Amino acid sequence: DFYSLIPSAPKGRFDGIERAHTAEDVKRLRGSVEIKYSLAEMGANRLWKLIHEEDFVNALGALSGNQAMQMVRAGLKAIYLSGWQVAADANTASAMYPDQSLYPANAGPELAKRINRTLQRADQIETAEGKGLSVDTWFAPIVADAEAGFGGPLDAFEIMKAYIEAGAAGVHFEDQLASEKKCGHLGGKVLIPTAAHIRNLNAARLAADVMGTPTLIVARTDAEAAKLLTSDIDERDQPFVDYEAGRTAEGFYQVKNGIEPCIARAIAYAPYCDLIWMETSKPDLAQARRFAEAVHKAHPGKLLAYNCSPSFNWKKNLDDATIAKFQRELGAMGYKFQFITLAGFHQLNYGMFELARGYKDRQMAAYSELQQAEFAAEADGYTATKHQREVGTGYFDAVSLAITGGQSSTTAMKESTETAQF
Amino acid sequence: DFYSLIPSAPKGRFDGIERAHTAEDVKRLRGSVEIKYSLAEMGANRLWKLIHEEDFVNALGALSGNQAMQMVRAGLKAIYLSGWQVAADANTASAMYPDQSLYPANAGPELAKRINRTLQRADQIETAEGKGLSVDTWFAPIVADAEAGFGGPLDAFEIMKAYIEAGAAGVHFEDQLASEKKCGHLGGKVLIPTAAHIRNLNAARLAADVMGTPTLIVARTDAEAAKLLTSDIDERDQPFVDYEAGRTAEGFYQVKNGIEPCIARAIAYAPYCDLIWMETSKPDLAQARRFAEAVHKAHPGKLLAYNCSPSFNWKKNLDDATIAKFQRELGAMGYKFQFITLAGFHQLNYGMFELARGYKDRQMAAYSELQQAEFAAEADGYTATKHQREVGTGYFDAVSLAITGGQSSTTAMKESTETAQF
Amino acid sequence: DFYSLIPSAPKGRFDGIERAHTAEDVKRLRGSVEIKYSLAEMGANRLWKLIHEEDFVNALGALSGNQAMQMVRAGLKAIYLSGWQVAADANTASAMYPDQSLYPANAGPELAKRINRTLQRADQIETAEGKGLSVDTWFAPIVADAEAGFGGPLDAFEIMKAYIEAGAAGVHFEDQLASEKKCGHLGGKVLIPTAAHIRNLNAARLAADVMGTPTLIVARTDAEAAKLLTSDIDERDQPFVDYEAGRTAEGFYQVKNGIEPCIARAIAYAPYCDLIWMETSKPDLAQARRFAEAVHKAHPGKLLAYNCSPSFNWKKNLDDATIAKFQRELGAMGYKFQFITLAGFHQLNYGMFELARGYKDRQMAAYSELQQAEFAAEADGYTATKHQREVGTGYFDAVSLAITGGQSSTTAMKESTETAQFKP
Amino acid sequence: DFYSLIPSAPKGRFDGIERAHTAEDVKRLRGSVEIKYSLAEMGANRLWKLIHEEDFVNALGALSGNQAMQMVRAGLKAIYLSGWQVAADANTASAMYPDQSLYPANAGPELAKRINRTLQRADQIETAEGKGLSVDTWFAPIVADAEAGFGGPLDAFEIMKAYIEAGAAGVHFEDQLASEKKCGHLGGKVLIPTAAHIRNLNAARLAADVMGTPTLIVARTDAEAAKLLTSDIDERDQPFVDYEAGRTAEGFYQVKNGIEPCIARAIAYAPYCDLIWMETSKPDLAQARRFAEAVHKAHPGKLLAYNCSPSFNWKKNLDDATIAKFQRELGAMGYKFQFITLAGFHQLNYGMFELARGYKDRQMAAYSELQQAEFAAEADGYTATKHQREVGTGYFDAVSLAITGGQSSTTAMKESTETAQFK
Ligand SMILES: [Mg+2]
Ligand SMILES: [Mg+2]
Ligand SMILES: [Mg+2]
Ligand SMILES: [Mg+2]
Incomplete structure (x- = not known):
């Protein structure tokens, strides 16, 4: 009835649900x-x-x-x-x-x-x-x-x-x-x-x-x-x-x-x-x-x-x-x-406050600590340290290679610092 | 010359700067x-x-x-x-x-x-x-x-x-x-x-x-x-x-x-x-x-x-x-x-990966650790623990009171959990 | 009092105006x-x-x-x-x-x-x-x-x-x-x-x-x-x-x-x-x-x-x-x-219905009729027939010349069909 | 091959088309x-x-x-x-x-x-x-x-x-x-x-x-x-x-x-x-x-x-x-x-220039002329004279009645001036 109007709806989805309309x-x-x-x-x-x-x-x-x-x-x-x-x-x-x-x-x-x-x-x-x-x-x-x-x-x-x-x-x-x-x-x-x-x-x-x-x-x-x-x-x-x-x-x-x-x-x-x-x-x-x-x-x-x-x-x-x-x-x-x-708001705001404070106090030492913490988090599944991959640089590289049948001179990842220093 | 076209420009602002246009x-x-x-x-x-x-x-x-x-x-x-x-x-x-x-x-x-x-x-x-x-x-x-x-x-x-x-x-x-x-x-x-x-x-x-x-x-x-x-x-x-x-x-x-x-x-x-x-x-x-x-x-x-x-x-x-x-x-x-x-990207992503992982494994215990960390940061300048204030609830309350000559029955802060628990 | 908070207000702007706020x-x-x-x-x-x-x-x-x-x-x-x-x-x-x-x-x-x-x-x-x-x-x-x-x-x-x-x-x-x-x-x-x-x-x-x-x-x-x-x-x-x-x-x-x-x-x-x-x-x-x-x-x-x-x-x-x-x-x-x-909605919707209708019926004849009507309105101050000028092509040409010291090879208007076909 | 990746593509859709990719x-x-x-x-x-x-x-x-x-x-x-x-x-x-x-x-x-x-x-x-x-x-x-x-x-x-x-x-x-x-x-x-x-x-x-x-x-x-x-x-x-x-x-x-x-x-x-x-x-x-x-x-x-x-x-x-x-x-x-x-741009700009010009010269007479032309176009299929229907006021009325089982007090069309003046 309503099930034929919502084809993806599983069996039992609308058990005990009333509607005002037909x-x-x-x-x-x-x-x-x-x-x-x-x-x-x-x-x-x-x-x-x-x-x-x-x-x-x-x-x-x-x-x-x-x-x-x-x-x-x-x-x-x-x-x-x-x-x-x-x-x-x-x-x-x-x-x-x-x-x-x-x-x-x-x-x-x-x-x-x-x-x-x-x-x-x-x-x-x-x-x-x-x-x-x-x-x-x-x-x-x-x-x-x-x-x-x-x-x-x-x-x-x-x-x-x-x-x-x-x-x-x-x-x-x-x-x-x-x-x-x-x-x-x-x-x-x-x-x-x-x-x-x-x-x-x-x-x-x-x-x-x-x-x-x-x-x-x-x-x-x-x-x-x-x-x-x-x-x-x-x-x-x-x-x-x-x-x-x-x-x-x-x-x-x-x-x-x-x-x-x-x-x-x-x-x-x-x-x-x-x-x-x-x-x-x-x-x-x-x-x-x-x-x-x-x-x-x-x-x-x-x-x-x-x-x-x-x-x-x-x-x-x-x-x-x-x-x-x-x-x-x-x-x-x-x-x-x-x-x-409100987890996202608290995490974003505390984290940045704590980083900005440390950055003001000790500049690059404060940032290196975050980076090292990132590196230690990889054993647990964290990948964002390799930020280029994370946001899709490798995916768009492969899109380029498929478009040009392999012959693009301007690919991103091969000569990156991410590839060289991570 | 250009100083009169850019009234806010300070003395010497354009020292040694060249333009193609007049x-x-x-x-x-x-x-x-x-x-x-x-x-x-x-x-x-x-x-x-x-x-x-x-x-x-x-x-x-x-x-x-x-x-x-x-x-x-x-x-x-x-x-x-x-x-x-x-x-x-x-x-x-x-x-x-x-x-x-x-x-x-x-x-x-x-x-x-x-x-x-x-x-x-x-x-x-x-x-x-x-x-x-x-x-x-x-x-x-x-x-x-x-x-x-x-x-x-x-x-x-x-x-x-x-x-x-x-x-x-x-x-x-x-x-x-x-x-x-x-x-x-x-x-x-x-x-x-x-x-x-x-x-x-x-x-x-x-x-x-x-x-x-x-x-x-x-x-x-x-x-x-x-x-x-x-x-x-x-x-x-x-x-x-x-x-x-x-x-x-x-x-x-x-x-x-x-x-x-x-x-x-x-x-x-x-x-x-x-x-x-x-x-x-x-x-x-x-x-x-x-x-x-x-x-x-x-x-x-x-x-x-x-x-x-x-x-x-x-x-x-x-x-x-x-x-x-x-x-x-x-x-x-x-x-x-x-x-x-890229500091914003690394803080946001690290912080949430870590929060989300603690939350998976230990639910509210992981979140309470963040909150406790927030409170602890108040001594150093942190304010976002009081999240209602941080985003302007107090400011808009004051707007409402100026609009209604002080009589509105629907102001936010007095009877908030923020005011009672923080 | 409120006039110093609003420097641009002319004399008497807020005459007879009450405010709840100070x-x-x-x-x-x-x-x-x-x-x-x-x-x-x-x-x-x-x-x-x-x-x-x-x-x-x-x-x-x-x-x-x-x-x-x-x-x-x-x-x-x-x-x-x-x-x-x-x-x-x-x-x-x-x-x-x-x-x-x-x-x-x-x-x-x-x-x-x-x-x-x-x-x-x-x-x-x-x-x-x-x-x-x-x-x-x-x-x-x-x-x-x-x-x-x-x-x-x-x-x-x-x-x-x-x-x-x-x-x-x-x-x-x-x-x-x-x-x-x-x-x-x-x-x-x-x-x-x-x-x-x-x-x-x-x-x-x-x-x-x-x-x-x-x-x-x-x-x-x-x-x-x-x-x-x-x-x-x-x-x-x-x-x-x-x-x-x-x-x-x-x-x-x-x-x-x-x-x-x-x-x-x-x-x-x-x-x-x-x-x-x-x-x-x-x-x-x-x-x-x-x-x-x-x-x-x-x-x-x-x-x-x-x-x-x-x-x-x-x-x-x-x-x-x-x-x-x-x-x-x-x-x-x-x-x-x-x-x-609702003037905008009626002129837009009427105008296009009628243009589309003429187009279905007799293709370019219907559009040419619009274009001549545009030429005919120029005496009364209409300018949009020269559409390239209207949207700023000439303005940005001048921007580019100021940038390039008058030398760019890629200015838009001089060799345009507007300049060649829409002379008086 | 590509036809299975693009399920809705009809027979012969890609006849003669070459691709750099596989x-x-x-x-x-x-x-x-x-x-x-x-x-x-x-x-x-x-x-x-x-x-x-x-x-x-x-x-x-x-x-x-x-x-x-x-x-x-x-x-x-x-x-x-x-x-x-x-x-x-x-x-x-x-x-x-x-x-x-x-x-x-x-x-x-x-x-x-x-x-x-x-x-x-x-x-x-x-x-x-x-x-x-x-x-x-x-x-x-x-x-x-x-x-x-x-x-x-x-x-x-x-x-x-x-x-x-x-x-x-x-x-x-x-x-x-x-x-x-x-x-x-x-x-x-x-x-x-x-x-x-x-x-x-x-x-x-x-x-x-x-x-x-x-x-x-x-x-x-x-x-x-x-x-x-x-x-x-x-x-x-x-x-x-x-x-x-x-x-x-x-x-x-x-x-x-x-x-x-x-x-x-x-x-x-x-x-x-x-x-x-x-x-x-x-x-x-x-x-x-x-x-x-x-x-x-x-x-x-x-x-x-x-x-x-x-x-x-x-x-x-x-x-x-x-x-x-x-x-x-x-x-x-x-x-x-x-x-x-550029059909849309010319129609829009010509039409409003002329409307505005008429409006400056003789105010409502100019707009009434537009409205009569609109009425005259209804035989040829034009409907936007009834602007309330045109943008879906009637449809959303029907949405309210389904929401409320026919019992909304606040429906728009029945007592509108469209219903009273465009009959
Ligand atoms: Mg909410
Ligand atoms: Mg950049
Ligand atoms: Mg309105
Ligand atoms: Mg184009």
Whole structure:
């Protein structure tokens, strides 16, 4: 039925998934020609496989293709794409922003394309060398942040399509007001009605069906911390509304936050998504268990996702042994996609700060230490020390030789210093 | 004469500089209105001040805004923009390329714009906090790679203008064939005639004059390693042509490479640039001395630039003492701008490979080690641990409060996990 | 006080203008260095002078730089930048969209920059030829559509800065919900509270102040046709809410649309903008006079803007004589800025349909007809038949000669077919 | 062999085509995963069909998605993508440029993507309306300008690939030096060696092969007017080099231009391309015939392309009857793809100059005239008078209703002024 509209969709893919629209709606709305989105198909099927096969799938937020590549090289099986990081250092306004849906709605998909393209080059490099891949596949699935959909259902519809074209495997949408969107761990968050978010999720699903891809949808609730709500029109929200307190000057309703609205919303969103995610204030396994248990009484076996946030101070909140076991324990509760949202930002910024500081103090000695550390990391699989090969110089050499039937006088690698000193 | 066309130019800025065009040419070709390029002016003049006053100015190649920001935070006084790194991970084709001028000609200027924008936000943040700046200025000059001009004099003209609008302080142009451009440390480089490169330096100078900015121009020569030359039409190149080899299948001449043609070309380029740069195969102080000495006999006091390249295996070529004193010794020779081209690429890629590998093997324990390392760096100047502040959340909060006369219910910081846990 | 923060502002620029923020807020929020935005300065001041001195300043919607260039060549003194047209054929998602704020927020300012760049080349070409300009200035002020600000006040603030950087002279904001934004002339518009739109207007002003430019702000109301409102929280909107009908399933309030809420909203917005604009359902001079009279009772001498929409059927509504005097009459009521929003889209799409149709039918005969019509327009100031000159070939030839000391072997124009076959 | 690497390539697609590289080279260089390029397949297979079945395929240069949409609605069967037009008003440096490869190399492919996306929306609109399409197909093949390939063979390889991703059906490359590229109808053109252009052509083909698409390659020569050559290294160019004149100051060789070198270069390029094209100074049937006949002596049946350039003054060159038959005559010679390169630019700029001028003189009367003409064109098939439908407002309404099960309050069309005033 829907399975014939999404040919790559595996058996069971849409078990327990409801749609507001019909199969006929999809045919009517997808135009007259078949256009393939291969990287979206592959990515979404591979993610589906991974989350059902592994203990759990864990990821880090990448802010560049290069970061994604090294993640995959090191053996990670998925890539997370943070909207927070897109705002900070990788968006289409070429500015640094806080995490408030300030940048243009195309930014996220543009980064997802960047990441897939770098992985494609990684793949082309190793395929040309003819000794097989150094990894399972270069095309690890990307799970990406669509924030609040950048407005209404149609904005959700459009960003979902954009992500699919860019080759993302999964996409997450949160029940905040786009016009006042915040980082989950900032104050002042404003919820939209349960129904209004079900519409965005359904828009995402319609986009996927219309593109013909089995793209995963992750529903996120920001209700643990959020104390404001745009409208009480939905009876499911009304019980958490503090009527005595009245409306704010902006017209917002005031609500009781915490695990209870997260449970209610999560259960109401369950049929319209593939994974559910509750933002939390602290890395708390007991809270995580409590949420997992309540969701699973209503929807046994529902797959969950968890944000291992750098907005948390880890060693303050937890002891060393709990830190060690954290993701493993979450995995056994059903949290099959886990991610450190802002890893890329922290790694990039600390690393460069520490190098620039050392460079100021001792100039070239500071750089030699990095280089030597790079050299020592090769036993463990690091290859970027040979930077020419890494970025594809040898691949493009072989492209040249094939074009000229071998007779190019201007090949790069033979007389390089990389060949002579590495 | 030119000083009135470039009002921001300081006294003696153009001492010993020659132009092919006249001041009247500039008035004819600059349009009828005055358009200011504030960051290009400030950057050019600051870089001019720095390179004369300081023993040497050293830099690192930044591939993103955030990297640039941390460099300036750490105390570095200038920023290098690497074409190699643009090709690798930061271009407008959204692909990973080797260093062969494959990406679209606008990519460098776009990254320059990103860097200045990130710096601008950083300056906005601290200005709004109202306790003064933590640096001398956030607007550290950017010295940017225009590669081989992306074609002819008109292409050189255009990329220079683009860099000026993006707010670059200095721009380098090399004497390679754009259609076969390579990294300076790879094989198969093809030089263009001495005359042809002077045409591009002059295109670039006219660009700055027409824009009304005292932008610095750095002429680079790749003759140390290049064994090919497109044409022997310039008598200055003929003495290095191996007429016994014959031409190559592409019609290129074969030349004898080494320091002799770098000196010749450098001396010939000196009147049409502000600094001169010879690419080297090894980090060799005696070679740098010999080059500096030769250049200075013809042109006393000429300012030089040097690439401290990651394409060298530093510990294999030099002992610890020579590495430690390397830049200082170059400085005393007149190499007043020195830069590690690929630092951003090696920090980003090393750092993430290592993080991703620890994360694979030990999950949150690996990430907590980074975070703890971040906190520990706070004593030395590090700030990105408080990531919400770093990217401008506090700044935009203050914007919101000015907009709403102080009444907004949806500000980010007060009830953030940042404010509670950091 | 604010005049020292905005050095280019002429005397009286901010007369009658209220601000939520202080001059200290501006100094605190603008960074430690001075950055200049030359085209924005020039555009804003020239637009300010034109709207005070001319009977009325009229414009057409440009969807490309070339379109804008011909408008200025033809003698128009301002340019309109339509969001509808951005959605249709000129946005940063490379897609055709209906007019519902579906494209990325940077699209408008990117088209503004394109337009100013074309005008810049046009000016360089003529400056380089040395015979003076064929127009008053190539840098006609651009007035540009910021739609609903693409979200809240901070989104409004950002699009304003983007437009200032791109060289926009004026920017308009409308009291619709960004997330459900529509063309003024479509159904299903949802208004935001009067207060919330005043927030967006002030964000815009703070933006201009912080950038240090006297950019014009045009406040638009969509209350003539809008039957929905996000919230009744603002007492000023409660007199128009139909409480009998209830809220929609989405929780929107239903309101009584028309001239009255437009008048009220407009009067509330007045102190926070430089021009006020009420979208209308028909080209109706009587309604336009009523609106002008009411606003002027509250705020004498307030400048207004009128949309001469192609979404109207003009001959169906009006006779030839009313159509002929329409903009003149509006000018006297105080409508000092008047624009045909979708002019670019209709001329582009009509023109090519008809050319393609003739081409299918009779191949080169259809094109030759266009070419002769171009020759025929030259007497009236048209220059684009000589296309090589128009796009700057001659300008860059002169650049190359300055570089090469007059010696290059590869100049383009002397041996071109333009020089050989397009002599008088 | 190559047919298994390019699954959608029809029988005989590569008859008579030579390659410097091998099937195995392709396998080695294309990576380990099959990525599909649907619109480029459909486009290339469609262009191939049309050029073998129609008397000739004629096209106009579109500088925007909207322009291309009206072209296809009007009944034209292909779209030309001009680099000249990209330079003028549609490039990724957001500037007006002359036609000299000064814009960034991604600009043409970006425009190709825009065109395909508009056409896709047009198709979506009609498919949702349910009455069938009003055109044979909305996805008319795009033939796109790759100019001088923006550098060496690797640059050609990359631009070819970008065009395939954008959905182009065919791409053209010219034997000029990219660093001093010009419009064919300007002076100061510098050619590259015959061999050097053949490598660009093969680079393009290797890209198509590696992408697994049967994209058409069109080889252009600028030898008719070009009097300069980078190098005389290729013995095929040497008979046309004026050695007595010597090299120019830049080191260029000087050559006898004209139809003879075009014929020789065309004959050499022929195995490395699907169509050949000679730029001309005048629209001259005799010169066209001489070119076609000489190329066909060496390569019977070779398809040709002809630029019907606005850089010509048409009525100054030709009488009304020769203008009238021009394209049909060329068709009979084997010129199966013909195109008015700068059609989009002239239409856009003429039309708006005249609109603006009328508007200055008499304000709304001028615009009302446009609107009436639009209404009058509806009988002939014009629809953009209803601009809201045209850009897909109706389609997105239908999207909302599917999202909300028919229950949106905020749909656009029912109460629009389009519905009320254009009935
Ligand atoms: Mg996020
Ligand atoms: Mg470089
Ligand atoms: Mg609009
Ligand atoms: Mg062309």
